[model samples]
Target chain A: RKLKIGITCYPSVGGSGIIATELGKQLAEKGHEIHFITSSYHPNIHFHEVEVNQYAVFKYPPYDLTLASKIAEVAERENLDIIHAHYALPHAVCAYLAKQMLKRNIGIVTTLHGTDITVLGYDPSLKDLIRFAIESSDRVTAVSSALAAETYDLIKPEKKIETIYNFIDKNTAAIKEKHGILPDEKVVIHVSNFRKVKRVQDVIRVFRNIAGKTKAKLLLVGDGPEKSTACELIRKYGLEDQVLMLGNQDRVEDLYSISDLKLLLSEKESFGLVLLEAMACGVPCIGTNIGGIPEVIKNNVSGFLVDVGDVTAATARAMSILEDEQLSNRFTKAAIEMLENEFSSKKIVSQYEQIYADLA
Target chain B: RKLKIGITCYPSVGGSGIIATELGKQLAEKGHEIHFITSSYHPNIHFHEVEVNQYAVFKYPPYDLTLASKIAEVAERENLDIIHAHYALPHAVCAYLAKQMLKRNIGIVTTLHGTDITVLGYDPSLKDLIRFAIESSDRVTAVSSALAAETYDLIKPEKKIETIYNFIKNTAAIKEKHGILPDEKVVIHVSNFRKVKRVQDVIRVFRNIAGKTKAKLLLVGDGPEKSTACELIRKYGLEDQVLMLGNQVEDLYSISDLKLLLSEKESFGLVLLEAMACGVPCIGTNIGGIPEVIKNNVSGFLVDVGDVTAATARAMSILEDEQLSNRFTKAAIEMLENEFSSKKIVSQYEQIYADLA
Candidate 1:
């Protein structure tokens, strides 16, 4: 049956919001009427700007409350069958509040897309409210099984959360020919918010390991505290000619298009979306064994998984994807197959539809 | 099925709070579990107080945030079936926040009991948020029809609000315990003495009529305006006739010949309802919600807010005129029985809870 669904999320530059925005777009194409009750509207969306009252009463903006009210209003207006909340903190909480306001029992399916583990813990006070949001949702889904298990270990929520691996929409991850490339150079890129746990310097060290053996160039595709140190390391290691510091660019999919292999050497990586995006663009990934990186990159198949704290081990896997054209071609084929069979938009969207149907 | 109710309110000695406290008490009696979630450390229920140990960065701790968190904790721990928030300002907002964290779909019935109209608007920014809380509730209720109408006129809440008149819980009077002479008529005024209550007007009206009738003025309750009323009492030299009974007094209403509520602003003059339940007629001002409580010449009398001359005349007529007193007293009794009875009002609340669940 065709259903009216309400979606609430940050819809920022990427990661969690990108997942939400793409999911909403996919859900719309599948015949369900989608309403984005967030702080924007390009699609069939309602841009309910919560007045960030640095405020008249509260010093912090009551974004959560305003979002909840907007969700409630849109739910009533659209007669929404379900609310697909992307994050746990405010969106899930907002969805729960909206459910209270609704006379119709529109269930909320909260997809815990890394905030409860990755972006959280910075605000220690928000943990309880976030947990409540997690526990309150009719159905809770996480990006990776590791993050889902860690939710039980940390937040210790009194509920069962399912694992729905993150997916890539072909429309968003569509390959466009990237400019500024040497015809002989093989690209080895690493993308992140560049937090300390990301161990981004290790990405440079791995590139240094692989750069000497092959005609390779390291592409540092993001910015953070590690940027200056990484730049200095590239200069100190005398790979200035090979390493390209392409700091924060908009069309990341274009960068993914010209890549030979992607490196994600984060000590505390949580289901690396960069790997998924790279794999979607016919690029194999070499990531750390810990966190959700192992789940995203199949070891020695689509890509290679190495110990985060080991550069020697990581570079050998990078060689496996880049050195042999036959194995490289096979890895790219397996990567595309994995994206289609395992983490495709079709597979993920179907999973979401099943959840919504069961809730109905 | 029996349900657990999380009753949230400032169960103070005020109109809104009294009704909330009484409603929970009644709900408990009706075979439902009552959990009093408030700011006080009451034995059965307590507001999980957030201490602002101001050594940290945030000087003023987020009270609303903490309250919402507490509500979530309590809701989960108790598995509360319903949360009956008795104000639309912070309580309703807090209730809405609490609903976010609960796994089970518990109903939030926000009783719009006067914060939307009275004791609100101090912070103009809260108007939008208050409107959200009002609109977000499963069912909204007001104490009087006038307050409910004012909600739409002022806040413009887009929801159907039912006028469930505030009912008085039966408080047994300490009969023959009050110092009331058999010959002297008693004029009682109860409120937390404020300029809005216009205790000065009550004192002036009582002093003017004291010489004509054998009467004792009982000024019950206290506030900042008590000193002003005290000065007026001493200045008038009616100390012997006037007795200042502090805060809670149940017996005075039983011995009262007439109840005076000459307030500039009154929301559903709950004192008038309390007095009527005690078989005492009331004389309230023709302002705000006083006229609704005292049905002018039918139940008691309604005079102008500051017109102590009209108030004195009305008090004198009710005290001296026997048939008029008899007729007003009979009307007051009937009004309480027909409209403000405990069963009908509590059942109205019960009916709401039923509809929500």
Candidate 2:
């Protein structure tokens, strides 16, 4: 029988949600019956037509612990063999409690995606709940090694957590369409939620300095609360016409059709999804050394990692590559090769299938 | 096979909670399997040493949501034929959702515990949650007709909410053996938490009396604002005289030297009954079935809710008028024969169990 796999995670505009959708789609392609459960489904929320099923438990006012309860109920109702929760805290708690309460032998796999452990999990007041939830999960997985170590050491090292890098499925992505690449004008793109963390304002600053030397159009894709602030800085620097705010386009890979350099200057990241997405489209990146960005971007080969807040130094490095089209071509080829070999969906999806096989 | 009941309610001392505790004990006594799931073991709750199974969820540093999750887990794991949740919004929501998740076809029996439905349930934000939780439950029960009617009127009347009054333990009324001394009056109030029961009002009334007459105030029970209430007592210059004795000993017959219940509302004031059983006449408000228990002018006095001035005047009259207090005390003890008797209330719960079954 095909594995009845149930997936629970947020289905909004988040890195974890996006990766979860992609993962479910990949699993579904392999003949696994994937059940996607969330609070709501976004426009970009992926639902595989072949074998994947989507279940949404709408949260009402008197919701108290109903979210946890509903998640537990659906897992049983679907006769799911195993549950894979993308977020740690409450999801883990629900799975653990559900197993004990139901007296069932259902396996629980929880993926610690960024804020679920790093931001909210590390908080002093909420640390106890986070620790309990993490320790209670049958199998715990984190996106990056640094994040895994951070979670195990800071939260609960006894949890026997595993590190699994995020994967990129570029097969379905629609690459470079209309207004494709302008050979005369190089494109430097930054795709993110445009939140305070991604530091999109620094993208404008770095791009303006690079634009002074090379003719390039800055692609600012994605939207968030900090969109207005990033736009304000772009207009203030007299680069309004030069900087393009794409505002959360579904076809992020298509934006790469017109881009030469990818700029993602974040303070910290668990797994830079944008870098892998850009690299999949054969676009080189310039990111910070913090978190998993350094893991993806090799120095001066596929991409370069600059010191955080050093926009001027980053700008100089970005211009050096963009100005030299011959070198950019070499780097893009190497970058696409790196993504295809390591971060490709085929390799990563097999790892998950193996995990499910072992548990099932 | 007897029905196995899993009770998820508060472990603290109160009307609904205490009555639930007593009901569980009685259910176990009648050969029915019982599982008491609480944060801690309540003092008044006692099994036949081996008959009842008490599983504490075990609260600690790591387990913050343990209480909610444990209730769901225990009810399902134990294969509890029915889960008797004590409140509406949170507990009912927990039961309904847990039952749904278990996919075991487990039934839920929810009791709308006192004030949340009657008063706080009307809050527009909690209305939908409350409505959904009530609708989700398989069976519903309330403590009073007023509460039953109120729950139906406030939310929806689709589900039948049965009224089962609170029961007390069978015990004889203790005499005024605390020894009423001359030139000294004892003022007391017992509650799970001090603030809601209005211990400060009792203190302020005693302070006013102590200013003119010889009187002492005793505040019982602990809660979130205990430290703040303690600070207020010290600031009011009654530190030496006033006593903030915390809760202990289930029944009010032995410990409470004098009974003073000045609460704004009481579903079925167990404290008043305890005071009446102790031959200690109560001075309380006319709100929320308090009139049903405390007879005005006959057993004790009833003041308008939140009217501390009128309450203080009534207290002063009871203190000064020795002959009237003696008459009222006799009447109060005699009145216990009519209602608020443990046997009478226990029978009510036994009938409710049969009705629901």
Candidate 3:
């Protein structure tokens, strides 16, 4: 049976927001009503499937308070079967408050993204609140098993964190015509918020290694605090010609179409949603050993997983695929195969449907 | 013993920072070496007494991480007996992490300012961290008893929060001779212009009282809500009657005939205490730790939140008569000297420091 689902997330250019919006879009296509309760609407989140709904929160006092009030208001009027919050702290806490305000028992699902645990969880002041949000939720999910394990280790909540690997909407990742591409050059793409944890420097180092051996060019998509540092490294190594730093791309899949390999060497990655996006485009990846990267990348099959800060291994893995045409095509085939079979939008949405059906 | 103490706080215009700076200043005077570790130097915090040290953290990448590393570095080099962190969360968390890294048992004393519990405490994400900071601290203190109780309710830490009311450096409240002044009575309000300060209600109540009596309004401190209060003043045609003093100037307190602080949520209402120390009686809302500071109609009136009529009537009662105004001024000064004397509060801090050291 289809159910009305209320989704709340930071409507920004982050992986969590991307996954949340994708999940909402997929669920809407599956005949379930979707209501997005957030501060601002991201243009990328506009879905043309089922009738899309939006609720905006006031930016005063605190975003969480306004979001929580909006959640309560929408839940009562719409009578949503499930309230799914993307990030644990504010969103999950907001969902918990909304659940309390409701007379009817509405299932609350909280997805623990990386920051709520890694950055905020270490904080002595926020750990209890984080734990409370996790425990109070009807069901808790982490983007990757590594994230779930990290949550348990840091916060030690009584509730179990189910590993729900993030999926990509294959429609959005549909291969566009590769334009203005050089056949002789191998392209390695890295997409992230450019936070220090993403290890953008390591991406540059891996690119430097690959560029030396072959005619490889690196496409750095997205921007954040670490972009300047990565830029400096590119300029320092005198690889500005080889490395193209594209700041904040609206249509990143356009770059993915031309990319032969994807590199995500973050210190902490919860599910590596970008890796999934790249895999859907038949672009193999080399991700860090930490967090959900390994779970998403089947070593030597779909993509490769190198230990964090291991530039030699990541460079070696990338070269192995780029140097040999047969090896590159094999990985590309497996990457797309895994995306279609395991992390397809339909399969992931059904998994969520089962979660809602069992709880709601 | 002249124990070395590493004190860290957000060097801002907030009550917590003021108290922390004042505490460091006083502790340094009390023959203890006080090392001030903060992001920037506050002009008010530069006390020329005893070798007061200062350390600035790099303003990049998660302030908590940098602050913690700096605290650790300072504590080791200075060989601090105690690391006192004002405002929990990152400050206390940083101190806790530093204590863990140190070879010797360097005591961590965390003081919980209002927001760490009132704002951040409510978030299910921050409560545990707040509790951990408190429990990890060798000694914990709250600015007011009400704040301590609020901390217990929200954080529920095993450690107890000692109630220590904040004190102001009375010398800084030096009266400046102003040349521009009409013979009209003056009523004052000081705040960071936040929504919680209830600046709108303050203006409404001031308008009510101003209509009844020949008095001018003095709006002190600047924040997001300053323009809103300024707009209300102009709309009411009280621009000529009201003066917007953007920041903490010592001279403004001297000219204030009556102080109004109608905050919706105030952990300690340190502004009320500052006005009281200036011998300027205050009328604050009976919320949070305000009632604990102002003894209802004795030192000042405690009106309900948004009760402009009641606040207006109370403001009129004090301003209308010279005898009543003198009585309030006397009572306020007496309370400040008796309850929140620097000697009393500083000794309390010393006792806690002695216990930790």
Candidate 4:
């Protein structure tokens, strides 16, 4: 009873780029509901872990592994085509568990994030399980080709995995109340060179998720192959009035300067260089759990690193960033900390300089 | 129209005090005008003075004289629709006096929380006047059904009182601290160490459990009995086991596993709700409102007051049997989220105000 979810379905069933690319509306909705429940999810299914055993102090409901039933419940209700699982050990395995719970067939798209393989990949104890998840998943994808090759060499699974590189969106900055928005409005920006690999639609979907809950504006500032597609998306979702598309500009720093959040939901970005633009202006950003994007965002500090195609998780993270001032402030501070510490000219320059001293 | 409401509470530091303040803020957040019609009488004196003693003549002039006037001023200025007072002690009476001066029919809602009914009511009409306070209120509410019944028994009134359990909507948070390990069980007791609270019994109960269970006692809130509470902590050689935090104890609730409130007389056991909200199971003496909060072996165990051995036995049972503890934790959260949600209770309160005006 304490957990209440208000569903928002603003996108048309045949909206622009959303349908053009995997038609991710149902996926967005499914993930949205799951995350809302996790923060708190929908459906009042009570878990009687009374038999399982449990806690005192340290309120930890990290019963994340037990998300099988919860996912199954969401799948059946939403009639989901694919349960986009992100990790190998628990999430992918959890999806398999959920698939068994239902009578209807469900597809699994397990995106291998860095940790499951980099950390757990070499463990002989976990090899069988990792192999099982890879073969079990109908379609598998890794953040980078580097990660995919590493997975194949280590896990030895026959299932071919796709290389879906990481990327951020084409948004960055808008002053809090300056964009015709009154007090307490959040401006979500994305600055991209709009390639299909950028997955610009993911930004639209995630922004649409946030726009339903609060007063917000999406600043899509870049021109690309996906530029017209992005335009069609804004119109398709009736967000022409809500979204501001300021096509490629030299004064892009102004957009970053005025922005609250910067998004980068690319499917194949080796490194999100644009993320530094937003961070330089002291804006916190959220990006996909792919490629070098994880290397950019500190996650829970500088910004949150979300799983690919998990728009709901991305939206939830965005809402938290927007809703909590202290949290957002900390994220901004952490962004500055990382910006100077990791990517500052002195920081990156010294790394290459030291390597250059050893010359190829 | 957006309501302009006035609220008053005595003791300015107790449960009713915090509850009244929290309600006002919550109501204000929901777009209502709130003027804290506080009676200028709370004086927690400190050495080297807190400025109140400076130029304060008549050895602290009776604040009761100005209490009613302050209410009158706020009511007129704010155009208050309702003047809600907590505890029949002096707040309700002062509100009655204040409204008498004003021509507007300001609705008076007096909430009964602990001492005013259980302890002070004995010293009423400090009993007759309390009855009038209840009768005078356009509406009356108790923090618990047990408290409402107790009101009927002691200050028996013609007007019926509705039981509105204290509703808390806690914002999410986190932090790690101190030496309390992940494996060690945390037993917490939150109460101002007044006489009726029987803070000694809490210590005894924890000390008894300490010998058998790998547990820590968190004594939150301070009072006159704190001296004795500290004395006992040292007397029992449990300094390393007990932590005296006094308050700002929000994070501790998240870390706590089991909460104990072995008060000689408790009206609502409000801290139990705070603990249960965080999935921390609680054990309270089945006295007054304690029984009402704890669902006896379902949500938590119910031991009689001063039953240290029994309290320890139940505490150990919860810590040892993880299944039983999990069930207790689950049940407590289920009960609170369903039965005492802020939305439901605030609506109940607003419904009463609508009927009054």
Candidate 5:
């Protein structure tokens, strides 16, 4: 049978959205038809070889195109043999409902990202629906091992949940031309949605402490619902002189080309796709020890993972690394090589192609 | 403390609908606030007070406000101490959902009619919901002993299913001018257009009898799927022979001059009783609780179920003797007086009120 799969993911910016877009684009290149059921298409996604289609879910009364209905309609109309939902809970429920409603048996594959399982999935109201969705799916996977373990603990099931790390297209984000960097000064960076969960406030605190110690500039990138709050914190601490609040930017990879050290001070992190993206640019990372951040940050080897919500420890670690040019360079090189070998988009896309081929 | 009661029922037509409507009407008449949470208002239910509040169950995304949600909404909105649901499956399910969702110690009363237990409740696909509904309800009542037994058989219970036979209004169809001529014999059949009463069987038995004797069969009333019966009457060469007179008149007492019920089943045979109350002797099938309502050799003749030949043969018996007819008519009048005299049953309901007192 020919491989016909439906991809239902968010059109908005997030790690899961980015992964879904890249996966669809890459899968299309591997001679498979990729049907994207999204409200809108992401800019990073490129259609090259295989057939690519986008079905706009018409919003009608009691028609949010929730996970179940979207999965059902797409599978039925497109004759999708399998469905790959990017989130659990509602997405998983949607796929399950679709599978039950399908004319023929359709396989359901769900990937539990960090917040969907660890944070949101544990909600008392949604816990039952989420448990049923996860436990009843034909195949279940997570973006990181920590997420997989968290899902098992929450649901307490013995199913083999596969841990598939999110990958980035280095060719898209890599600097088209290399530029010489200043050896005298280190470029410290922070990239996020600036949401409170991302702890962008802690970034200012740690960055302020780092600024007090080293002659480094803090490049704050990205904006979100918490942007105003972060800006207030930036003003209150008077870090406006040293911290460059870049707000939201599209070419974040290009910014990484001129940066030295990356900051990810989140209370919780999923796959830390941004950390991997920065690593692809030969940048060392300093993030909190929560979620899957520790999976990527091997303590003293590639980068550092400090206790969460600890501004002093986070600031001390960043200042200690920035002060040592040789230590930071050594760490960035190891981090770059490790991330390249572990999360290659080509290798990851091949595994996805194999998944589709097996089901087909 | 005044008893705060909640009545949850279908705002539509049928046995469940009428009984619920009448009870709510009477309860409201007694100065009690009766909250009616329904999708629509039923016609038979005329509320003198604005106590019958209608709560709309609007659909929400991903989850439509189902029957369960409406029950919960009503129970909470009115701060109801007790909820009385007229039918089994859905009403019970709604009550259960409401109880769980609210986590309240509210009482639920479920009243099972014949079909609610014998038909929908007996199905395996509905067994779980039916069981849950019955289990969740604090009290259970069946309209008849037959219905109560059926409920017990279908659902295992913690409490006994009590019998609460239906009640009608004391309003009698005053004998004005006798509409039918002595020579012109009219056999009337009234229904809500349901098939289980076998409207086709009514036409079949009526056709067989009309061919043997000169008689007019009046197909009275309409319902959900009654067009098929109308079409069948034409196919069976009874189109011109039978009058397809639609609906019952408020003074519908005229058509029941000679009532014919070829129904396969009934809980109490409200139509049969109505015909008797109008002094129109009936010929009904022995199936259902027809024996309780239709006294053999008295007001009506009860024949073997599906024996149209026997049923039609007995129709001739009711018309044959004037003296016997007059005697059975007096007994029929006494039957209504002894059993369903709205005074006796309404007082029985009053006794129900007294018990709660």
Candidate 6:
């Protein structure tokens, strides 16, 4: 069924914003009216996204009040069915205010994306406000099962949190390009924003172990504070020829297309979006057995999960996947099957539609 | 001692705004820092007030959010001891948001001035929001005892509602000019000219008494119904005797020999106190908190709503005898001194601040 959806997020370069944008676009494609209320309104980027209206404003530090006022104005003018807010800090709190100000029982669906809960959850000042946003929402969703459990363990909200896996649009990932790097040797790719939690150095350490085991080249595609350390380690280890340090490249699906194994060794990942991207591109993953990574990767079926910082185990799994062609093909088939069955755009969008309908 | 205070109110011409401005000015004179966070900025009217800073921003309908944002901004920068919001719905809610956002454990003092709890209290959507604002406040106050009791009865908030009577600055009451019909005694009515004010009753009562006594009606405010009140006076051919002062005049208290406040629903007749403090006898309606401020037949007379004949008779009886008028005036002045003095109210507010801080 169609709905009038008001989608809000931190509209810069982030996983939550990307998911929100994709969800909004897919919901509109399914014949729902979508309104984008965010901080920055990019004309060229947003103008062509048909069947969606946009309202954007910029503020200094705290964007909660501005976002709340805009949401109130738009909800009243458009008579929104549900306000889908991405994060708990500003968006959910803003939606709460909008609901109060509009004086309507507007449905609020707040989706928790990682750090807002993990980092800000321990803060003495914001925990109650965050709990207020959670308990006040009509429906609350977390991006993964691990995140849902973590939220319940930390905030202890009375509301039940449903686990909805993040999805990537099919069209955005289908246009693949073949590169020269694919024909030479077995390739493994690790992509992230490379914060400390991403464990970029662990990816390099696993690659160092794998470089000795087989003819493999590790492709690191992202840049952040950890990128400097990873690059310095590459030069120091004299594996520059085998290790390619790509800094923040777009169309990362192209890298996943040429890769045989995907490595995501993060200590804490609330449903790794990169793992999904790699799986959708038919690459078996070797993620750390932590956070939601184990939830994403099927143990020994789709791929393998190793303990965090256990580079020896990760390298062993990578060598096993690269050496056995039949096992690698089976893992690849299961990885694609996981995407089609569980994390497809249509399937996740249908789950969201059910939520909106239940609340409506 | 002195505390850094943040004050917020609706910037329009309402009793809450006037009381907030006067309270801020008085607090500043008492050597406390006052920061005014509102929509409109008028520097010339408040220039010489040292230790008072104004942060003004104009917006459209939902000024509450803007006001909250500014309150948070100013509270953080000023390290305010307490943020005193003048009304409950928007101002107190805004203060709640500001306190949550500031996270400074800063105190919040909310004052319930009429209409918010009276008109919007029963609204199904607003009752809880208003209750949240009141219950979350560090200290809550109402302008009169009746208002405080009415708030407790209506919202049933857990917070104790302190009855702090609204005070006027002594400088605004110094009566100077009497050029307004110096020959005849003056009867004055001041309000925002809303319907509940029963402004038409003022016209009716004035028309009744003007025929018997040589008196002029001085309407000292403006709003939507000002034109209606003016048309009523014109229809009665009382235009020659009535002066429709378009806005607030400083010396209207000086020339007002008798004050007529026939409002059917006044939370607290602040204008009655204003006139009574100026030694002018008042006659208000027997509704709301008016009776609490105006002692019937002593400080001022209280007549029933739409009782123009009774109100006119009371006005004439007070004006006819110089001795009776002087007695009521003396009683009114004594009530102002014993009850609604600035020193007394300011001390109570300071004590509240100390408890909250």
- Whose lDDT is higher: candidate 2's or candidate 6's? 6
Off by over 4 Å in 4: A1-360, B39-60, B118-125, B169-176
Worst 10 contiguous positions by lDDT, candidate 5 chain A:
A50-59
**On a 0 to 1 TM-score scale, where does candidate 1 land against the true structure?**
0.58
For residues A1-360, write the lDDT of model 6, one tens digit per residue: 667889877664557778988888777777788888875532211211111111111111223444675787678787788999887766787788878777789999999877656535333334555666788789999988888888887777779899999888744233222333535477889988878878888888888888877777887888777788888888877788887777778778778877888999988889888898888888889998888888788899989999988888888898898889888888888888888888888999999989999988
* Tens-place lDDT digits, model 5, residues A142-240: 888988887777766446788878888854223322322234556788888766678988888887787777766777888777888877887887777
TM-score of chain A of each: 0.90, 0.88, 0.89, 0.51, 0.86, 0.90
Worst window of 10 by summed lDDT in candidate 4 chain B: B45-54
What's the true lDDT of residue A342 in model 4? 53
lDDT score, residue B146, model 3? 87
Task: Report how far off residue A16 is in candidate 5 (Å).
Answer: 0.7
Question: Per-residue lDDT of A112-220 in model 3, one digit per residue for the tens?
Answer: 8776765453444455556767887999988788889888888898998987778887442233223333666788899988888899999999899889989878889
lDDT of each: 0.77, 0.67, 0.76, 0.67, 0.65, 0.76
- Which window of 10 residues has the lowest lDDT sum in candidate 1 chain A? A51-60
> Where in model 6 is the C-alpha error above 4 Å?
A1-91, A94-108, A111-345, A350-360, B41-62, B118-122, B169-182
lDDT tens readout by residue for model 4, B43-152:
11101100111011111222332455567666776678998888764567657756755668899998988656543323321354456567767888999888898788
Per-model TM-score, in order, reads 0.58, 0.56, 0.59, 0.46, 0.52, 0.56
Best-first order by DockQ: 1, 5, 2, 3, 6, 4
Model 6 alpha-carbon miss at residue B238, Å:
1.4
Off by over 4 Å in 1: A41-55, A123-128, A156-160, A170-180, A212-215, A224-229, A232-241, B1-67, B70-91, B95-149, B152-357
Residue A163, model 3: Cα distance from true site in angstroms: 1.7
Error of 5 at B150 (Å): 32
**Native contacts, share recovered per candidate:** 0.08, 0.06, 0.00, 0.00, 0.12, 0.00
lDDT of 5 at A148: 85
What's the residue-level lDDT of A102 in candidate 4?
Answer: 61
